[PDB]
RNA sequence: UAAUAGCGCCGCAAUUCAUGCUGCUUGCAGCCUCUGAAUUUUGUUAAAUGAGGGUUAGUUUGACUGUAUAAAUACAGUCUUGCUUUCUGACCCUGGUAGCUGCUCACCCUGAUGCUGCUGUCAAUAGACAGGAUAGGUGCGCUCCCAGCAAUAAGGGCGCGGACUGCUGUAGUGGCUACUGAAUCACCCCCGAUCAAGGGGGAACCCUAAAUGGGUUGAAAGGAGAAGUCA
DNA sequence: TGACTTCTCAACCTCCTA
DNA sequence: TAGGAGGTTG
């Protein structure tokens, strides 16, 4: 699932609680945390849930197999304390307060009740939670929990600036992980199809294999009771969700010149339903552009004084670039659901490196026809001053906001020359084209 | 006095187009009013970017429902919370105190993606005082260029000693800590809190005759953590 | 440090209390 | 009976 997101909030308590939490973590949770990854370097993931058993004496239950798991991500890769993450739908449970707002309370933590201070932009969310933790509590456990909106959620701190206090320095902060298509009750229709498949998928795979009779039983158990209760849906609201063209395409071209050019074309016909170019896309945020690739510029040169020997370069940083290739995403993802666009086509961002040298190249040779001393000069210049695009962030925020609004993303190959709007119509049209085997 | 020239950007123009407008013949014809695209040609008495470091639980971008709704949107109602970000404003500063620490210099030459560059007065010393972000140059910036430095790029020349070192003063230039000075804001003022909490008062614009009558008195975006690799 | 890459995204079934 | 906390497992 690409579909989904993390909110986040901020819990608020009494000097009490938090010192319990604070107390809690950093002297228990941490600690175990190091010394099962130094057992696991020295080791000759299964086996950590044994291996944890030992150490479960040695110094908040849910907690110790929660450092179980940030083990194993860890693993798997190949003062502020580590954060506490509940991978479980029911580890956390809301309640509202006397005074309106909403609380969180710890399966770990008896005592330790948190208010919880979030942005009206994603209130919504919370409230979500509860209403879908209630819908349980009303249906006494006839819901399956695949369907409450709430995939897991780790709880971290966070740095200050007043210098004088163990914890009231830090801040806590909640990060839910969400599905975004759990909300409309047509994206939840499709989420159960697909969980009720993948159930069906692995059922067959452990039933050809023998285990042990209660566990087995027990895991069995638990399936058909997901299956049984998932049919049974909740009172979320109706979108219609996203119909698609298959033959209208909008393809997205790449290049140094232009960031981000984009072609709504037609496949079925060969005419190309409407252009927009960066500045068209930016609209009133164009001057963004501008004044990103001036920082870019001054970053780089920072850094390049700075190779040798210097402080961290992060001086004048920002998260510009960030904004920018999220507003561009919003805008291409729109500019496709307005003409019923059924699929966004991206370049492979491997040929991405090759595709910016053939661009200059290309501006080279069409400044100075055959002035090879001119090309390379200008060439050299062109880098100086209109530096690289960050081509990954691009694809990976238009990949999240075209799987959360419902357009399928494929991935075609730009072609090498041309200009910005025909190298878009092209790939478009080398994407259908590819399609079609 | 100097910034010639070059590159990127920003607009102003012209031509050509359509991603534009018209017209139905719905893919054609014409046109450039809008919206843009592509060049080249310019930087005004004009336009748009751009303007050193900081300051808000800042405002807006919100959810559901019912519609008119394909949908946009708009209306109506209810609810609304304060997280992380990016702009635009407005405001404050151009720091002090102590310490601790890194770098670089016998002396010359060439001169780096090197450093410095605001105004005014006093001096015309090298520094204070007052202001202050319009801050060296071009409309705006730049590794470009200009003036000075340049030991703190690199390379070369090159004296006295010890056997790679010294010719070195806080001298220049950086970093770290602790305390501390101002703004602690989003129409303005006052009080009040910061693991919470808002309240009061005032001004102006539209509706409203007028009414504590209502509003308005800038907007945007969010998927987060962890690990590894490359540069 | 930037850029890239990988991965992460339960859940009903038990027992226990108030 | 309805929460609160523990379990397990490919």
């Not at 941490?30 to 058993?53: A, F």
Request: glycine fraction near 6%.
């Amino acid at each position: 699932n690409a579909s989904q997101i993390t909110i986040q909030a901020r819990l608020i308590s009494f000097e009490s609680n938090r010192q319990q939490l604070w107390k809690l973590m950093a002297d228990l949770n941490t600690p175990l945390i190091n010394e099962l990854l130094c057992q696991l370097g020295q080791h000759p993931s299964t086996v950590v849930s044994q291996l944890c058993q030992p150490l479960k004496t040695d110094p908040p239950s849910r907690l110790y197999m929660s450092a179980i798991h940030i083990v194993d991500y860890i693993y798997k890769s190949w003062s502020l304390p580590f954060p506490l993450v509940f991978e479980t739908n029911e580890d956390m449970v809301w309640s509202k307060n006397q005074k309106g707002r909403l609380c969180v309370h710890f399966n770990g933590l008896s005592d330790l009740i948190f208010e919880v201070y979030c942005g009206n932009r994603q209130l919504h969310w919370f409230q979500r939670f509860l209403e879908d933790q209630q819908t349980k509590r009303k249906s006494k456990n006839q819901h399956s929990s695949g369907l409450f909106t709430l995939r897991n959620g780790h709880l971290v701190w966070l740095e200050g600036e007043g210098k004088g206090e163990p914890w009231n320095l830090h801040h806590l902060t909640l990060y839910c992980c969400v599905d975004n298509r759990l909300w409309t009750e047509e994206g939840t229709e499709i989420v159960r199809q697909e969980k009720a498949d993948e159930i069906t998928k692995f059922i067959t795979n452990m039933k050809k294999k023998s285990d042990l009779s209660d566990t087995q039983q027990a895991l069995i158990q638990r399936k058909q009771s997901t299956l049984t209760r998932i049919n049974n849906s909740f009172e979320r609201p109706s979108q219609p969700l996203y119909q698609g063209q298959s033959h209208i395409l909008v393809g997205v071209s790449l290049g140094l010149e232009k960031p981000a050019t984009v072609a709504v074309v037609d496949a079925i016909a060969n005419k190309v339903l409407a252009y927009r170019s960066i500045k068209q896309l930016l609209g009133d945020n164009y001057e963004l552009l501008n004044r990103q690739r001036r920082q870019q510029q001054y970053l780089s040169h920072e850094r390049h004084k700075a190779q040798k020997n210097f402080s961290p370069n992060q001086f004048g940083a920002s998260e510009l670039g960030q904004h920018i290739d999220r507003l561009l995403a919003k805008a291409i993802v729109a500019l496709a659901r307005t003409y019923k666009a059924g699929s966004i086509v991206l370049p492979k961002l491997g040929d991405m490196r090759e595709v910016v040298q053939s661009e200059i190249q290309a501006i080279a040779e069409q400044k100075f026809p055959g002035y090879i001393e001119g090309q390379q000069k200008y060439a050299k210049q062109y880098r100086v001053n209109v530096h690289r695009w960050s081509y990954g962030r691009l694809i990976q925020s238009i990949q999240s906001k075209a799987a959360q609004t419902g357009i399928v993303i494929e991935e075609g190959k730009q072609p090498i020359r041309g200009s910005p709007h025909d190298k878009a119509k092209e790939l478009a049209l080398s994407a259908y084209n590819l399609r079609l085997t």
